[PDB]
Amino acid sequence: MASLTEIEHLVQSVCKSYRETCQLRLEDLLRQRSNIFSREEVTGYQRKSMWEMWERCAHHLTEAIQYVVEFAKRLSGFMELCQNDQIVLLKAGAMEVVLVRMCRAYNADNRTVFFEGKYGGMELFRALGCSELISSIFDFSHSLSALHFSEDEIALYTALVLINAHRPGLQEKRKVEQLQYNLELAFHHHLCKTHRQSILAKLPPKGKLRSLCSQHVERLQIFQHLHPIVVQAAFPPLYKELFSKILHRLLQE
């Protein structure tokens, strides 16, 4: 099954789905690179409370995840899967898709990320008290930046991050394997056509994204133990569902 004509159609549909569900246009992020937080604005973030900074980050992550849910809904083959499997895939892969998407908002020249209107370095996040997690996130974006991904490569690669037939809990594992295989063919065909197969060996191991997701859950457990009422009262419901229902409602709209 699936011929060359169908594989190229799948490439274009995935790229279109990605372009339609980007939270931020790449051009918009690039044209903000000179807009960097001053030392006074950096000090201001460092003086913010730990719970205020955690709440802000959980809110920004939840917004980004909402766009990944829309990407999945437009992704060829995804809505054809059962609701159980749609939820299993999003719960395990939404954070991973955001972790890949965020390289677009990272400037490797000065090691800054676009955050709340300006670019700032790791030191902007010191109030969180999760230095190892922040260093891991910046290192991950730095490693992705070195690949010089095109928008089309990010679309195909993030579709594969989401459509992973190895996720525990899948009820129709063979249907997810077939979708994964078609997407793998589309990604590799596009790399072959554009002479970009050299990136294959340089893509991060799957254990790297798993380690970032595990570090996030572990730091959230520590924070939630110190401020349980902050999480209950001020963290987004979708964030608590995924990391501590909403997904079912977003998938039905």
Ligand SMILES: O=S(=O)(c1ccc(F)cc1)C1(c2ccc(OCc3ccccc3)cc2)CCCC1
């Ligand atoms: O702009 S961000 O808030 C940001 C936070 C930390 C960072 F180092 C760089 C950027 C955002 C992001 C939010 C939470 C993330 O992990 C989970 C997490 C980490 C730390 C505290 C709470 C939650 C990762 C990324 C970028 C993509 C979507 C929003």
